[PDB]
Structures are given as structure tokens and as C-alpha cells.
Amino acid sequence: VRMNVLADALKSINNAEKRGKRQVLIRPCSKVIVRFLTVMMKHGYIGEFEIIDDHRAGKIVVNLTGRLNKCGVISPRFDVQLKDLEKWQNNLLPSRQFGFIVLTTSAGIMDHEEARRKHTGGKILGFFF
Amino acid sequence: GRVRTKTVKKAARVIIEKYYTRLGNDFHTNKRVCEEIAIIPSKKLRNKIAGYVTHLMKRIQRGPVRGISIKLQEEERERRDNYVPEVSALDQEIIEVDPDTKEMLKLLDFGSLSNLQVTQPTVGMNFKTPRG
Amino acid sequence: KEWLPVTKLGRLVKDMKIKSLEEIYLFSLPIKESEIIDFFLGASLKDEVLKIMPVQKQTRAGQRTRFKAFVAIGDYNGHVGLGVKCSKEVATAIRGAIILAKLSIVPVRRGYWGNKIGKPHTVPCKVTGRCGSVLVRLIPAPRGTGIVSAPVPKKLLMMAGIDDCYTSARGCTATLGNFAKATFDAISKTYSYLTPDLWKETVFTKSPYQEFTDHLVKTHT
Amino acid sequence: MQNDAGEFVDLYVPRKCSASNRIIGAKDHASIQMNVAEVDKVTGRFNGQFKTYAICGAIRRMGESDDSILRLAKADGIVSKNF
Amino acid sequence: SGALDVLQMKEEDVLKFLAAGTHLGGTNLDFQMEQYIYKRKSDGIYIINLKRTWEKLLLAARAIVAIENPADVSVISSRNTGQRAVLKFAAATGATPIAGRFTPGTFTNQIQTAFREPRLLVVTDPRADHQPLTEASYVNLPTIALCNTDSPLRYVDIAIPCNNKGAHSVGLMWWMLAREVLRMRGTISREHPWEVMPDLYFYRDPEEIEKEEQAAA
Amino acid sequence: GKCRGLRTARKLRSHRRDQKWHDKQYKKAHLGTALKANPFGGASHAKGIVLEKVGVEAKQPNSAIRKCVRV
Amino acid sequence: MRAKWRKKRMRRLKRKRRKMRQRSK
Amino acid sequence: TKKRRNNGRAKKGRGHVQPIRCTNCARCVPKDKAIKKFVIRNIVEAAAVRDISEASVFDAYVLPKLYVKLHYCVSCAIHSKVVRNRSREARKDRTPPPRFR
RNA sequence: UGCUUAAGAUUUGAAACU
RNA sequence: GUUCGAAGACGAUCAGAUACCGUCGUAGUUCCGACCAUAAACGAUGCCGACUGGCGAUGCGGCGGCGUUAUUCCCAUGACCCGCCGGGCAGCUUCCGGGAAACCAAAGUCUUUGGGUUCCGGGGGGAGUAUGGUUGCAAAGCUGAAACUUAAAGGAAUUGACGGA
RNA sequence: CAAGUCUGGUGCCAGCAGCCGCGGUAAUUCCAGCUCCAAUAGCGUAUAUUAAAGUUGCUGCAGUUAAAAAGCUCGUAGUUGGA
Ligand SMILES: [Mg+2]
Ligand SMILES: [Mg+2]
Ligand SMILES: [Mg+2]
Ligand SMILES: [Mg+2]
Ligand SMILES: [Mg+2]
Ligand SMILES: [Mg+2]
Ligand SMILES: [Mg+2]
Ligand SMILES: [Mg+2]
Ligand SMILES: [Mg+2]
Ligand SMILES: [Mg+2]
Ligand SMILES: [Mg+2]
Ligand SMILES: [Mg+2]
Ligand SMILES: [Mg+2]
Ligand SMILES: [Mg+2]
Ligand SMILES: [Mg+2]
Ligand SMILES: [Mg+2]
Ligand SMILES: [Zn+2]
């Protein structure tokens, strides 16, 4: 069964691109996933989504544009200091121009370019480009 | 086995296509003509060519041919193309129209028509194919 | 010698009307004639024949050898081309494979590695590419790094001007037929790959088959 | 594609699709540019100006060309809103 | 193809649709073609929408009219039924048609006889005209097809849902597209009716032609 | 790998620590009785005393008698 | 040998080697 | 390599069926592997029914038939020329052979 | 409408762009 | 303890047959009771989890429906017919996608590499052998090396010659 | 893997060769001359070893047919556990 919902959603958002869809539905509503989608929205990879509320694990309907190559998820979760984040973006992204490793810290969920601002590191959740 | 070769088949046609009016039906007439409409070196090839030519002018006078273009018959085919009946075959009086096409006709612009002789819907649902 | 063209594109090239090869790669028109490319690029158009490969089959009397040929062609800035063709001997075959190499050239794309001063020299992202069981991965490089590769595609990347690039391979690289097509497919994907600078939507220009339809009719069929 | 001083250094901007938003290469010999003519609203003749559309190949061989044409024309003001 | 009162569907074209039978579909619905069909009958015949017939017919004559040269619009048919039809639509416009037995390689191989480079394909039926819908994917070509409610959309580009079995529907749908492309380029008035008959475009049995020779005189 | 947890180290290392023993160059060189049964004993030269001169045939396409010395 | 007759001859050799540890045990 | 998708038989969801003997040989074939012909046949072919129907007592006595359900193995079913091997591309057609001659 | 029909010494082949 | 029938005797066939062919035939084949735990035990494809195209079928439970069919006195139960839904063995068709290829709605979502989690392989032979333990009345089974020896052994498709096909 | 179809001898003999391969009466590969090459006061031959090896694989391997998933379920430790 489902040990990671965020890890069955970024694959359910991976299999709609290689087909060429427009809008898709995900079954559980995590607060992590919600802070994740509102990370990808600030960079404008996707459109504006919405959440559906029953009194359960709510649902989400995402609108998709055409700039989203591959959204991923790391398992398991690690700890990444400031001298490891270089050796992750060395060999987990295409180039140094774009792509966004995303990681939670004690300050909140943010990308690595921001983690350099705030001089902070913490546990990793995934990557998207 | 007397089977005529392709070198014969290819020369019977261009001669027909260019001298269709001049050719006839007797063998010894077009047997003399192909000597002076064509550079044929020998005699045996002469009599073989005209021998298959007088087999096509018989097949043509019996019907048309696939791979040869007849201009006299192109005129009759052109008129067979251009044949138009006088009275129209569409602007009739009675159009049998089912009530479910009446429905979407209601959802169209033309809500009422003139001569829609509506018919009965077929009771019993049997259109499929038995399995063996 | 005075090549007479057959097609609409050969007629439009004979009258010096289309000015470059960018309006063919902008439209993906099929290039079906060899003398266009020589008409544009006879200057810096070089050749490096890779390998002669004597394959053969069997009949009821001896065996029958027909030689296959690999030719890599291209300048050092902008375009590359490959050609493979087999015949009874090398004189005919090399001549008949330089043809298909001129008939199958593609544009390369190039970016930077981080800093953006000077001129573009490196591959914009990490690409891959494969044929058979050969998997070639191309990696971007910092300035002055040099070509880090095999002696075979160091020759083919040289014929694209890309000076600084790490490479990698996987599989049975001894087959030069495959390993060349793999390093050709890896560099034929670079204009099919989205970069978030390519976001500004395309303005649709007019077709050239539509821009020049008046003059073609009083010059040909 | 500007290095440090805004110089456009690539040799051509490629095309870009209109349905699935994934761009069309040079070797893609299964790509369409449609041309649909505008019409005046009182007579029904040809004005002279075009609406143009591009479609990449894998969608086309998949079989969804018309649903994109039908949506791009419905959104662009050709076909009435009932349909 | 709409948002206008002028270009609407007139009654004499409606009664000549219900007359010939371009509403009577096939039997097996295709999943790409759900949006044009109203309601399956008993006897299991699907009911088409004339509005979504006319919106596609007008979009086909828009694309064709916008094309400037009339002399590179090819039109292919192979069934025995619409040979006469695709030869008089091409007489009314000036198309360069192909009437049966499409020789392969004629779009891609230069040294053949009629090596042609067109810009638009129109096809009577895709099942039996499955060759050129493949030779449309090596040269960049749009495609129009006279689709039924049953045929697929492999490599087709705009579809016009019709009937394509009887001896009446193809000659009509070619005649109506002849009128609308002439009511589109300024050649023919729109208000007046077309002079000659859309019964020109039918198929005649080699029997019925031999039957109308005896009692004619 | 097949297990990917955060605290699965004694499973990984006690799986690699077994499956190394099925290598051939690790087992011959490292612990085992090959250094025991080397006639030199893990060295590069050895002196000897001749006792006889014999010859040995050669194998296939070839046909000769090579020369060997029992030591 | 196929494989079954090889497997059979091994068992006809082991029923001989345990026997040929006679007088010796 | 693997040559047919089902392995010549119909064992899809059981794991075991029972064996059935042939007729010419005695080779044991499981049931859904066998080639089951069904032979109905008159006791007179064509020309002796004229000489039965004349020498009978009753008025056109209808003759009986002889209903036999056969089986065959593989190498009898081929050595007696009922089935013939086919090309790979014309294996898949599993319609029965026609009934004209 | 089917009977039998064992065997055959060791060695010996390779292609370049102008 | 019917029928078949390892071992065995016998009659032919064959150069020779201790083999196939044919007559007889013990041990066994069947039943209850104690054991042994091995098979191409094969879909030669570990188990849970979803996800991403369709098209006809077939089987249980359920949801409606024109209409025939019997019960006749009809709602309701039975039999066909047209649809919907769950999961269960399957099938055609396809440029999703992959793969060395045959081929697969999974052997797919993999250099754009990470959903969780069990067992196991590291060239071929020597060899599933030696020894050491251990369960078993026996036959045998589970764990299970080396010494030496060799540059090929092997899988998928292509052409040719060949077949008492 | 840079560089002799040079000349004279043996004729599956004697021998070279890490690997493919050479030698049976004209050997570019053998013993010798001539010539030619690469490193240069240094160079080869053994052995131990690291990289190449994503052929020990945490980054980064395989398990239908090539080596490969226990015959089948249950099950305590362990490992991982929805909102
Ligand atoms: Mg791993
Ligand atoms: Mg096999
Ligand atoms: Mg079984
Ligand atoms: Mg017995
Ligand atoms: Mg015997
Ligand atoms: Mg027993
Ligand atoms: Mg027992
Ligand atoms: Mg198990
Ligand atoms: Mg081994
Ligand atoms: Mg082998
Ligand atoms: Mg050397
Ligand atoms: Mg080592
Ligand atoms: Mg391996
Ligand atoms: Mg195996
Ligand atoms: Mg097994
Ligand atoms: Mg087992
Ligand atoms: Zn049998």
C-alpha cells in the first residue's frame, strides 16, 4: 500500500505529460503536497489548481501547462548540509541554470537558491524541472 | 505453345493508339500496312504483330479495353458522364421521419416541416448476429 | 554539370530566392536533392571517412562480398552530417555515402556553463541517446576543459565546434556503426528540448511555399 | 538567449506547437501548419487575412487533430457557442 | 463557420439531407467520434448532428478557400461510388484529382511519372484510402476525410461526419462543398440557387445506364 | 539495490559481505588456500635443481615438440 | 550423456564409495 | 524460442486436467490438447442404397447413420494428413477450414 | 495397407583512400 | 486382487537386439494405517500499491428497460433481448513505452536513473562432487568448498546447402 | 600499435608470439645481413597491486528464453507504516 502519497502523486503527474494531458486528479491532500504545488506555482510551471473538500483526505484537480518536463520524488528522505547540496545538484539536474531541488527546513519548505539566502539546510523532499 | 511476348504486346498498342482509323479487320490488309507505318526488320515479326492486332480490333468491337485510349469512345464516355435526368430525384413530396429525428429537429432551428410523414418505431430489438 | 533541378525547392534555390538554410529547418521541409548543400556550403565542408566494413553473405557458390562505408561530414560551427552506404566497392560506396551525409545534416544548439560572457561553446544540458545497446550521455563542461571522450566521437564533436564536453558510454562500443549513430542521436535532440527561455510564444510567419507562389508558376509547371 | 549584453546567439528560434505545447523540430516530417481564412460578417466572402495553426506529429498520429482544431476555432470565434 | 445569421443552414439543404440520408449512420460507434452523435435508435443505428456536420463543412471550405493556388489541391478516391463526384468538383474548381488505384511512391519518389507536390489532401474514405494517409506523414500535409460515425482518426486532420455507403451521400457532400467554396470565393451569388443538379455527382449502375437507352427514343 | 531505507545498514553490509566471496579474483588472492598451495608461496622467483630434460608436444594446428625441464 | 543417465551413474558411484569404506570403519 | 502463446492447449486457469487416449496409437494426450474429429457417416455411401431401397420391404425405409466421436494424437494427426504445418503468419487464423470439398 | 536402409581420418581464405 | 504391467521366459525381425513388434506374466496398479518432501511443481515471468488507449465477448451478484414466453387470475418469480457497475480466467487490434530481438496494457512509467519489502546469480567445466554436520527404517534429501584445467561454451534473428517432412 | 611485401638460408622440421595467428620447397611474423621505428643514460621480462570495472553496483548492475524468483501459504524478531 501507499507509504508515500507525495511519491504516488509526482508519478501520477509524470504519466500525464508523456501522454500529453491537460488536467488531472490526485486522491490524497497533504499539507506537504499543497506547499509543494504552491512552490511550483510561484515559478509558473503549472496553472492554478484547486482542492475538493469532503470530510476525508480531500482531492485535488491540477491544470497543466506545457513547460513541465519531469517532476520527481526522492525516497528515502535525507539530511543535506551546505556542502552536500552542491554534490546533489552536481548530479541530479541537467544544468546549473534551471531545475529546483526542494527541501524542508525548520524555517519552512523552500528551494535551494533560497536556502543559500537564509543560510539554512534540512531534509530533502524531491526535485522538479 | 503460342504465347505472344511483351515485345509484341507493347507494339500492338502504340500502333492502335496512333492509327486507329486506318486499321481494319482483315489480316492481310493491316499486314501490308504495318510495313509502312513501322520499321519492322523481318517478316515473321510482321505476321505476329498483325496477327494480334486483328485480335484486338475484335475484342474492341465486342467491348472496351483497359489499357488503350479510344477517342471515339472517350466521347461516348464523356456523354455517359454528362448524362443528367430531367426531373429531380430528390425534391419529392413525402419524407418518412422518425420521432427521434423529430426530437433533434426540435432542437434545431427548423422546428416544423412540410411533409414529414412520420412512421412507426420498430417494436422488438433484433438486429444483431447469431453466434453460429 | 549544370544541375537541373526537379523539385520546387530546387527551383527556388536555383533562383537565389531563399537566402539561407534557416527557413528549411524552421519549417522542416524535406530536402530531397544533394546539390542544395553544395550550393550553400562548398567552402568549409569537410569529410572524415570513419571505417570500411566488409560484410558478406552466402550462396551456393563461394561467398559474396559487398563493402559498407561510414562517412562523417561537417564544418566546425553549426552543422553535422552522417552517411552509411554499402556497394560492391569503396569507390562507388564512399561517393554514395557522402551524398547521404549531405542529405542528412542537422543543426546543433549550444549554450553556456554557468557564466554567460563571450561566445557559446558548451552543450546547454545533459542529453542522452542510443541505438542498439549503446547508450551515450553528453555532459556540459566548464571553459577550457577539453573534449573528454573516445577517439571516435572526439572526431565528430570536433565537427560541431563544441570544444568542452564530458561524455559517457554504455554497452558494446566496438561497433562503430552503432556508436556513431548514438552520438548522432544525442546531438539531434538539442532543438527538441525545452528551456525556460523558450517560453515566449512563437509568432507565426508565412509559409515560403506561400510567400513565393507567384514566381514559381511562370518558371516551371 | 542573451549572454551578458543581450546578443541573440542561436542561429534560429525553432517553431512551437499550439495544442500540447511541445516544440517541433526540423526533422519532424509530420507537422502541419493550418491556414483558415477570415470572413466578412455581412456577405460571406474572403477578406484576405489568415488564422494560422501548428500541430506536431505524435499527436497527429495519435489521432487528436480535430479536437484541437475544434477548440482553437471555438475559442477564436469561428464556431458559435452552441455547437 | 458560424456566429452569423447569413451562413446558416437553409431549409432546402436540410430537406435534401433528410431526403438522401446523410443522417443515417452506421452501427459501431467510435470513441473519437462521440461528440457528433445524438442518440442510438432501435435497430441500432446512430443519429448524427447536422449542426456539427455543417460546422465542419464550413471549416473545410474555409481552409480550402484560404489556399491561394487552386491548382495544388489534390483529391483522392478509390471506391467505385465517388469517381464521378471527385471529377466534377475538380471540374468546378480546377483541382488535380486522382481517380482510383493510387500508385505508391508518387508522393516521395522523384523519378516516377506524376511526381506531384501538393498542399492538401481530401479523401473520400480512410479505411480503403489508407495508403496516402501514410504518405501524408513523410511530407507535411493536412488532411480532410469524409468520415462516417465508424471510421477512425489516424492521421486525419479535420473530419466531416457523413454517410458514405449509398450512391447519394458522397455526391451530395461533394456538391455542397462545391457550392460553399463558390459562395466563398466571389464567383457565385449566395442568394440565388445553384443552377444544375446535385444528381450529377451520383453513381449510376452500368445497368441503369443500359436501361435508359431503350425507352429514351 | 532493492531495499532503500534509512537505517538498513546491517542488511546491506551483511549482504555485500557475503556476495563478495563469489568473486574469483577476490577469492584466489585474498583469504583462502591459494597462497598456501602456491609452489612459490607468494613470491616472484624460485631456485631449483634440475633432475630431467623432457619434451612436450604442441597442441592443435601446430605440430612440434617444445622443450621442458623437470625441476 | 543426456543428463539423467549422468545423474544415475553418480548414485551408482556413491553407493560404491560408501561401501568402499569397508573394513576401514 | 517460445513458439505459441498458449502452449498448444487450453490450460489457462486450472493447473491440471485428466488424460485421454488416442485411437490409432494409444498415446496419452490431455483432453484439451487432443484433436477431436466428429464423424457422422451412413452405412452405405452412394450406390448400394439403390439396391437396398429396391430389395427392401418397407416404403422408402430411411437408412440410419453411424455417429462416432474420434480423437487423435499429434503424430498420428499429421502422419495421416489431417492437419498440415503452416507459416508463422498464418498460424493465427483459427477459423475452421471450409466445407466445400 | 507402415518391413531393413550401418558407416566416411588431420590439417589448411585474407581487402585502401585518393 | 478385474484389467493393464517394470523384472522374466518365449516367437519373429536384424550382420548382432540383451530394443521398438506379438502371445504369457510376477512386483505394483485399488482400499484403510504409519512414513518419505522430490518434478519442465512452467506463465520456464516473487508478493502489496497504484498509475497511463480503445474495441468486441464470456461467467457470479447487483441496477433499469421495448417487447415475446409460460403461471392465467397478475403484481411477482422463470427463459430470451438492449444497456450500467464491481472483480475473475481470457481474446483481437495499436508507433503509449520499452527491448539484443522474438515479443509485452506489462517484461511500461529507467542516465529525465530512488514507491515499500523478501530470496538468489558473477565465465565455462571440475560439481551439486569431497568432507563435516543433520532429518529418515531404507532408498535419499537439506547446507556445501578447493585443488587443477580451458578461450570459448551459450541466447535471438538473416542467407545458403541439406530432410527416409 | 609507430615502422620493409629488401636479399640469402630451413621447409609443420628448429622456433616466435601477452591475444587472434606464422612454419608442409618463392615465409613481409623463424635464424642472419641490409634498412626502419619508439623511448635515451636508461630500457625490457616476472609478481604484488589501483584506475579502466555501471564485470561487486549506497551514487550506478541483473533475475521469461543466455548464469538467475524458494512448490505453496502461515509466522516471531527485523525493516517500513494513511489523513
Ligand atoms: Mg540504489
Ligand atoms: Mg531452442
Ligand atoms: Mg502442473
Ligand atoms: Mg503383465
Ligand atoms: Mg532385449
Ligand atoms: Mg502406491
Ligand atoms: Mg504414505
Ligand atoms: Mg513465497
Ligand atoms: Mg564461476
Ligand atoms: Mg558457448
Ligand atoms: Mg607492441
Ligand atoms: Mg586488479
Ligand atoms: Mg552483469
Ligand atoms: Mg537458465
Ligand atoms: Mg522454480
Ligand atoms: Mg524446488
Ligand atoms: Zn496417435
Author numbering:
A (entry chain X2): 2 to 130
B (entry chain S2): 2 to 133
C (entry chain D2): 58 to 278
D (entry chain W2): 1 to 83
E (entry chain B2): 2 to 218
F (entry chain Y2): 2 to 72
G (entry chain n3): 1 to 25
H (entry chain b2): 2 to 102
The authors write:
Blasticidin S (BlaS) targets translation by binding to the peptidyl transferase center of the large ribosomal subunit. BlaS is a peptidyl-nucleoside antibiotic composed of a cytosine, a pyranose sugar ring, and an N-methyl-guanidine tail. To understand BlaS’ impact on mammalian translation termination, we solved the cryo-EM structure of ribosomal complexes with BlaS, eRF1, and eRF3a in the presence of GTP. All three structures have BlaS bound in the 60S peptidyl transferase center.
In class 2, called ‘Hybrid’ (29,879 particles, 3.8 Å resolution), tRNAs are bound in hybrid P/E and A/P states and no eRFs are bound. In the Hybrid and eRF-Bound cryo-EM structures, BlaS density is observed in the P-site of the 60S subunit at the same position. However, small differences are found in the positioning of BlaS’ cytosine and N-methyl-guanidine tail resulting in a slightly altered hydrogen bonding network and clearer base stacking with both C75 and A76 of the 3′CCA tail.
